[PDB]
Design a protein around this ligand. Structure first.
Ligand code: NA
Ligand code: NA
Length: 1120
C-alpha cells in the first residue's frame, strides 16, 4: 500500500503490520496495551530511514505514536488524528496546506537528518553535506517552518557485509529529551519557568550593541511585558537608566591585561562562584574527554587565570530578577597577540565560556535560552559546517534547551549559521527609519551656475565653465571626482556633466535616523518619510523603462540626473502623497492613465504574469506593468504594517515562549523587499542548486560590460589582464548569484540548464561572439558563503580549467598566459615541476583552518605592534591562503599558492546590497577589500583600481568608484547637520556609531592611503573638536557616553602619530588637552587604543602639561 499506518509486530518485531484506517490502528493499540488515556499524541511521517527505535523510545517516554506512510495524501490522517507535534524525515517540501494547518492549530514541526555512511566516516568529514542532498534535507524544509536539524540516523555493517540503517544510541536520548522539553512549555505555569538571556557588551565601560537597536530600553520593555504576562520577576528598577546603571555595576566584561579592573570587580560585583567539583561533574556529564584535554592543553587546569578567587573558584557575572537571568557573552578565543594562524590546530574556548554555558544548563536549570540582538559568536566555533556531531562545540554547549534568537531583517545571510549550527529559532525585528539628507540648500548656487551654463547659446562657452570650475574647486568636489584644479583651463562638457550628476546624487540620498526601540513605533513624520522612501523609486524607474520601450525622447533624461528628477521623480512623489492621503483611489483606471496603456493591454500583461507564475519585449513590458500595479496598490498596507509591527513582535515572542508556532518569512530590508512586513517571523533562504538564475545572468553581463568600459575609459582604451572578486552570502541570497554570473562572463563561459531549471554543466562561448580577449579571474570567499554554496566554487574552478585550454581564438587568450606566468613563478620558488604544474591552476581561496574571517582587524588596530605594511601583507597572505576549489583538495594549504595567483591583477571588485551600511560604517568592508588591495599592491608593485557593485536599487544596478562613494558617504552623514541632530536624540548605542566610523576611517587610511585625504581629517577635527556647527556635541557625549569621545580622540591622535595625517601643532595640542581632560574627569574606558598602547600614551603625555601628564599617567596605571 502507498497510504497507510504501520507498526512493528509485537511477538515478531521482524514483520510489519499495516493498517488502512485510524480505527483499525487504535483497536490494534488497545489489544496490545499500547494506548494510554489522556496522553499526548505524536505523528511520524517519512521514508528516509528506519524509525523503530525512535517509536519505541517515544512510547517508553509516555506518548501515543502514529507512524503514517503516505507520500501525497497525508493531510487526511493529520486531520483525523489531530496530534500535538509532527516529526518528518523530510525529502523535499510539504506545501502551503501544511503551513495553514500549523498556523490554525499552533503546533510544532521537527525534522531530523540522515547520514548515508558509517559513524567513523561521518565524524571525520569536515563538510557533512553538500549539493542536492543538502538542498533536499535541510534547505527546502525550512520553507515550511521546520526546526532542530538534528543528525540522528546512520548505517552499520553486519557479518555478511550488508549496510543497515539505524539510530545512534547516544543521539536518541538527546532527541527525546529535547522533544520533552519543547512539549513541556505548554503546560507549565508561567510563574515557575526559568529563562536565560544573553547580551553583548564592550570591554570596560563601553555600551551594549546590536544591529540598529537601542538595547537597554528594549530590555526594560521586554522585562515589563514578561512581568505583565505573569512570570516571576522581582526587584525590577524604576526606569531604564537605573537598569543601565545596574548592568554596568554587575554585568561588565574585561580584557586580559586589565588585572586591577576585574580584581576590583571580584570584591564589588557579587558574582556567582563555581567550585571544582561542580565543574568536573558538569564536564563529565556533557563533554568528551579529548576536547576537554585540548582545552586543558590550551589554557591549563581549572580555574585558569581570569577572575579567580584565592580559594580556587571561578567567578561568573550575571544579573538575576526572580526567575529570569541576564548574562554577557565572554570572548571565544585567547588574546595571545599572535596574528598568524598555525595550520593544523583548532581554537578551543577558554574555561569561562564553557563554565557559563554549563552553569546555564545544569546550575540554573533554564527552561528557555534567548540571544538578544545581532549577532553573537557561539555559532562560529569549530568545527563542522552542517550535520554536527558530538565533537562540535555549538552542539554540546546548546544542549537540549529551547533556543530563541532575535535577529534583524537586513542580515538574512548570517542567520542561516545560527539556524543550522545552534538549532535556534529566529524572531525578526525592524530597522531604523529613513529620511532625506536635506543638503540641497548647501550646493544650490553651484546648481544655479551649472544651469546657467547649460542654457547658454553662445558659440564660446568658457566664462561659465570658469565660474563652475571656481565653485567646484572652492568646495573641494574636484578631489572626489579626480579632476584638476588649474587656474585658467576651463572644463569640458563631460566633466561638467559628471559634476552635475555627483551633485544631484548628493541631493537625493537617503539616511537613517534614530535607532529602533522594541515596543515603540516611529514618529508620524518618520512613518511618512519611510513610506515616501519605500514607493517613489520603483514607480519612477518603471515609468522611465515603459517610456523608453515605446520609443520616446528619453535620451536627455538618461544622460542627466536633473532632467530625470524633474520628469519622473516629482510626479511619482505627488502620486504617492495622493494615494497615502486616501487609499481608496487605487483603481484600474488610475493605473491605465498613469502607465498610459489601454485596459486590454493591462489584461494581456496580467495574463502573461499569471502564466509565468512570448517575445522578450512583451515579458519586460508585463514585468514593468506588474511592478507599477503592486507599488500603487500596497501603499496603505505598507503604512499599516509599519504602524502595527512593534506589538506583533512582542506578541509573537510571548507565543513562542508558550510553545507555539512561528510563521516563515523571507529576508531583506523594507526598501529592497516589501514582503518582509510585518515582523516577528522566521526567515529562510533560496536553493543554491538553481543559481545563477535566468534573471541574474543579464544583470551580471551588463555589470561586467560596465566594468570593462570604465577601465578602458580611465586607462587609454586598455582592457584589464586579471580581475579579483570577493564573495559574500547576503548579496548571493538576495540577488540570485549575480557576482558568479559576472565571473563566468569574464571567463567567457555560460551555464546550461536541465528540464528542472538546475545548473549542472558549462559551455564555452565562441571567441567571435565574445568580441574581446578572455580575462582571468581570482576569487576570495567568506565562511558563510562556503557554508551556503560550495558546489558553485567547483563550477567556477572547472570553468577556469575549461577556459584555459581553449585554442584557435580570434583574439588573445590571457588565461593561458596567466597560467604560464604562475607556473614560472612557482618554479623559481623551488618547487617540483609536477607540483608547480598542479598548483598553477588554483583560483579559489579562503580562510585557513576553516575560520570564518581574515583575522586582520586585530593586527591593524594594534598600532604599536607593527611598523610597515609589508608585515600586514605577509600576515594576510598567510591567513587567507587555503584552497577550496575542489572536493578532493578541500582546505589544503600550499606555500606561495596564493601569491602566484595574484600576479598581473588590475581591478578589485566588491559587492554591496544593503541600504543600512556603507563603506565607512561596516568594518568587514575594509577588512576584506583593503586587505586584498594591499596584498595586490605589495605583490605586483602597482596600486590597482577598486570598484563597487551597487545592487541597492533592484531596478537600477550600477558600478561605482571607491573614492566617489567615500566622498558621498562623508558629505551626507558625518558632516551633515541633519544627521547629527537626528542622532543626538538617542542614547549610548547611538553614540557608539561615531567612534565606529572614525575607527573604520583609520583602517581605510591604513589599507589604501590614496583614498583618504587630509581635508577629510581637517573637516572631522573642525566639526567634532571645535564645534563649528554650534550643535553642542561635547555635552551630549558627556551626558551619554564619554567612552566614545575618548576613543575618537585616541584614534585621531594615533593617526597623527603614525604619519598618516599631516596635522599641525595646534590640532595635536587641542586633541591632547581634550583627551586628558575627559580621561581625568570620567575615568578610563580601557579599550585597545586607550589602555594597551604604550607609544601612543607617551606621545599624548609629551604634548600636554607636566602636571596633567603625571595625573594622566597615574590614572592609566591604576587599571593595569
Ligand atoms: Na574593529
Ligand atoms: Na559580523
Amino acid at each position: 500500500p502507498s497510504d497507510m499506518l504501520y507498526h512493528a509486530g509485537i511477538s515478531n518485531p521482524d514483520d510489519e503490520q499495516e493498517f488502512l484506517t485510524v480505527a483499525d490502528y487504535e483497536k490494534f493499540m488497545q489489544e496490545n496495551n499500547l494506548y494510554k488515556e489522556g496522553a499526548r499524541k505524536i505523528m511520524i511521517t517519512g521514508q528516509m530511514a528506519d524509525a523503530t527505535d525512535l517509536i519505541k523510545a517515544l512510547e517508553n517516554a509516555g506518548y501515543n505514536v502514529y507512524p503514517v506512510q503516505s507520500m501525497t495524501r497525508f493531510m487526511s490522517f493529520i486531520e483525523e488524528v489531530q496530534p500535538d507535534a509532527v516529526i518528518n524525515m523530510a525529502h523535499g517540501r510539504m506545501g502551503d496546506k501544511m503551513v495553514d494547518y500549523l498556523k490554525a492549530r499552533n503546533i510544532l514541526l521537527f525534522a531530523p537528518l540522515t547520514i548515508n555512511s558509517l559513524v567513523d566516516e561521518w565524524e571525520n568529514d569536515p563538510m557533512g553535506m553538500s549539493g542536492g542532498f543538502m538542498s533536499q534535507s535541510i534547505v527546502t524544509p525550512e520553507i515550511d517552518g521546520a526546526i532542530r536539524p538534528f543528525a540522528l540516523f546512520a548505517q552499520y555493517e553486519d557479518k555478511e557485509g550488508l549496510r543497515h540503517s539505524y539510530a545512534v544510541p547516544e543521539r536518541l536520548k538527546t532527541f527525546v529529551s529535547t522533544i520533552d522539553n519543547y512539549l513541556n512549555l505548554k503546560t507549565k505555569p508561567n510563574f515557575e519557568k526559568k529563562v536565560a538571556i544573553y547580551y553583548y557588551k564592550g570591554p570596560g565601560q563601553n555600551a551594549l550593541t546590536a544591529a540598529g537597536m537601542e538595547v537597554v530600553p528594549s530590555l526594560y520593555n521586554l522585562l515589563l511585558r514578561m512581568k505583565q504576562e505573569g512570570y516571576n520577576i522581582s526587584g525590577l528598577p524604576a526606569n531604564a537608566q537605573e537598569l543601565g546603571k545596574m548592568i554596568q555595576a554587575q554585568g561588565a566584561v574585561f580584557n586580559a591585561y586589565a588585572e586591577g579592573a576585574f580584581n576590583d570587580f571580584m570584591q564589588n560585583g557579587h558574582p556567582e562562584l563555581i567550585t571544582k567539583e561542580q565543574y568536573e561533574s558538569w564536564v563529565k556529564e556533557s563533554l568528551r574527554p579529548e576536547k576537554y584535554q585540548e582545552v586543558v592543553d590550551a589554557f591549563g587546569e581549572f580555574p585558569g587565570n581570569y577572575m579567580v578567587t584565592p580559594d580556587g573558584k571561578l567567578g561568573i557575572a550575571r544579573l538575576q530578577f526572580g526567575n529570569v537571568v541576564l548574562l554577557p557573552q565572554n570572548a571565544a578565543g585567547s588574546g595571545d597577540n599572535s596574528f598568524q594562524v598555525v595550520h593544523g590546530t583548532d581554537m578551543a574556548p577558554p574555561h569561562t565560556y564553557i563554565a557559563s554555558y554549563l552553569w546555564m544548563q545544569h546550575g540554573f536549570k533554564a527552561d528557555a535560552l534567548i540571544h538578544f540582538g545581532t549577532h553573537g559568536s557561539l555559532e562560529f566555533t569549530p568545527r563542522k559546517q552542517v550535520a554536527l556531531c558530538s565533537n562540535d562545540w555549538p552542539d554540546r554547549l546548546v544542549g537540549a534547551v529551547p533556543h530563541y534568537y532575535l535577529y534583524s531583517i537586513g542580515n538574512v545571510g548570517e542567520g542561516m549559521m545560527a539556524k543550522r549550527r545552534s538549532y535556534a529559532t529566529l524572531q525578526s525585528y525592524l530597522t531604523p527609519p529613513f529620511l532625506e539628507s536635506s543638503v540641497r540648500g548647501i550646493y544650490r548656487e553651484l546648481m544655479e551656475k551649472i544651469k546657467i551654463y547649460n542654457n547658454s547659446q553662445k558659440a564660446n562657452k568658457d566664462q561659465e565653465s570658469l565660474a563652475v570650475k571656481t565653485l567646484t574647486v572652492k568646495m573641494g568636489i574636484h578631489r572626489d571626482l579626480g579632476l584638476d584644479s588649474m587656474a585658467n583651463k576651463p572644463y569640458t562638457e563631460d566633466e561638467i556633466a559628471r559634476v552635475e550628476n555627483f551633485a544631484e546624487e548628493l541631493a537625493t540620498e537617503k539616511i537613517t535616523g534614530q535607532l529602533y526601540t522594541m515596543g515603540v513605533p516611529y514618529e508620524p513624520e518618520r512613518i511618512t518619510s519611510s513610506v515616501y522612501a519605500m514607493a517613489t523609486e520603483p514607480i519612477a524607474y518603471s515609468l522611465f523603462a515603459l517610456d523608453k520601450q515605446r520609443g520616446k525622447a528619453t535620451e536627455s533624461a538618461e544622460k542627466h540626473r536633473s532632467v530625470f528628477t524633474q520628469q519622473y521623480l516629482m510626479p511619482a512623489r505627488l502620486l504617492v502623497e495622493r494615494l497615502m492621503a486616501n487609499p481608496s483611489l487605487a483603481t484600474d483606471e488610475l493605473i491605465c492613465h498613469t502607465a498610459g496603456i489601454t485596459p486590454q493591454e493591462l489584461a494581456k500583461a496580467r495574463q502573461i504574469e499569471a502564466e509565468r507564475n512570448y517575445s522578450k519585449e512583451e515579458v519586460e513590458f508585463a514585468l514593468a506593468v506588474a511592478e507599477v500595479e503592486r507599488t500603487i496598490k500596497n501603499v496603505g498596507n505598507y503604512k499599516n504594517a509599519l504602524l502595527t509591527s512593534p506589538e506583533e513582535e512582542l506578541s509573537s515572542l510571548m507565543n513562542a515562549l508558550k510553545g507555539g508556532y512561528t510563521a516563515p518569512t523571507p529576508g531583506g530590508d523594507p526598501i529592497a523587499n516589501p514582503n518582509t512586513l510585518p515582523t516577528g517571523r522566521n526567515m529562510y533562504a533560496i536553493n543554491a542548486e538553481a543559481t545563477p538564475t535566468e534573471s541574474a545572468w543579464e544583470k551580471g553581463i551588463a555589470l561586467a560590460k560596465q566594468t570593462i568600459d570604465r577601465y578602458k575609459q580611465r586607462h587609454n582604451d586598455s582592457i584589464p589582464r586579471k580581475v579579483s572578486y570577493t564573495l559574500w552570502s547576503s548579496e548571493f541570497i538576495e540577488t540570485g548569484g549575480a557576482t558568479i554570473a559576472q565571473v563566468l562572463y569574464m571567463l567567457g563561459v555560460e551555464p546550461v540548464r536541465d528540464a528542472f531549471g538546475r545548473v549542472s554543466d558549462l559551455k564555452l562561448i565562441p571567441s567571435t561572439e565574445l568580441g574581446r580577449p578572455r580575462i582571468d579571474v581570482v576569487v576570495q570567499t567568506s565562511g558563510q558563503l562556503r557554508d551556503l554554496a560550495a558546489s558553485r566554487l567547483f563550477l567556477i574552478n572547472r570553468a577556469v580549467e575549461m577556459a584555459a585550454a581553449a585554442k584557435d581564438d580570434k583574439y588573445e587568450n590571457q588565461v593561458a598566459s596567466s597560467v604560464i606566468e604562475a607556473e614560472r613563478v612557482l618554479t623559481e620558488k623551488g618547487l617540483s615541476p609536477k607540483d608547480a604544474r598542479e598548483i598553477s591552476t588554483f583560483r579559489v581561496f579562503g580562510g585557513a583552518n576553516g575560520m570564518y574571517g581574515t583575522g586582520i582587524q586585530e593586527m591593524v588596530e594594534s598600532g604599536d605592534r607593527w611598523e610597515n605594511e609589508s608585515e600586514i601583507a605577509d600576515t594576510y597572505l598567510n591567513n587567507m591562503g587555503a584552497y577550496y576549489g575542489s572536493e578532493k583538495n578541500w582546505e589544503v594549504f600550499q606555500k606561495f599558492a596564493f601569491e602566484a595567483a595574484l600576479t598581473r591583477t588590475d581591478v578589485v571588485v566588491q559587492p554591496r546590497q544593503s541600504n543600512t551600511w556603507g563603506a565607512l560604517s561596516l568594518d568587514h568592508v575594509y577588512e576584506f577589500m583593503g586587505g586584498m588591495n594591499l596584498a595586490v599592491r605589495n605583490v605586483t608593485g602597482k596600486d590597482p583600481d577598486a570598484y563597487l557593485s551597487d545592487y541597492r536599487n533592484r531596478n537600477h544596478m550600477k558600478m561605482q568608484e571607491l573614492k566617489e562613494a567615500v566622498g558621498v558617504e562623508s558629505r551626507t552623514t558625518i558632516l551633515n547637520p541633519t544627521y547629527i541632530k537626528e542622532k543626538m536624540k538617542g542614547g549610548a548605542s547611538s553614540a557608539s556609531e561615531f567612534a565606529e566610523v572614525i575607527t573604520n576611517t583609520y583602517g581605510w587610511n591604513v589599507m589604501k592611503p590614496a583614498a583618504i585625504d587630509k581635508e577629510l581629517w581637517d573637516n572631522i577635527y573642525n566639526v567634532y573638536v571645535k564645534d563649528e556647527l554650534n550643535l553642542g556635541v561635547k555635552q551630549y557625549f558627556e551626558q551619554q557616553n564619554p567612552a566614545a569621545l575618548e576613543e575618537m580622540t585616541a584614534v585621531m591622535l594615533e593617526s597623527a602619530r603614525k604619519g598618516l595625517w599631516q596635522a599641525s601643532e595646534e590640532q595635536v595640542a587641542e586633541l591632547s588637552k581634550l583627551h586628558t581632560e575627559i580621561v581625568n574627569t570620567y575615568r578610563p574606558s580601557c579599550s585597545g587604543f586607550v589602555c594597551d598602547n604604550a607609544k601612543l600614551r607617551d606621545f599624548i603625555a609629551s604634548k600636554a602639561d607636566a602636571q596633567t601628564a603625571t595625573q594622566y599617567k597615574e590614572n592609566i596605571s591604576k587599571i593595569r
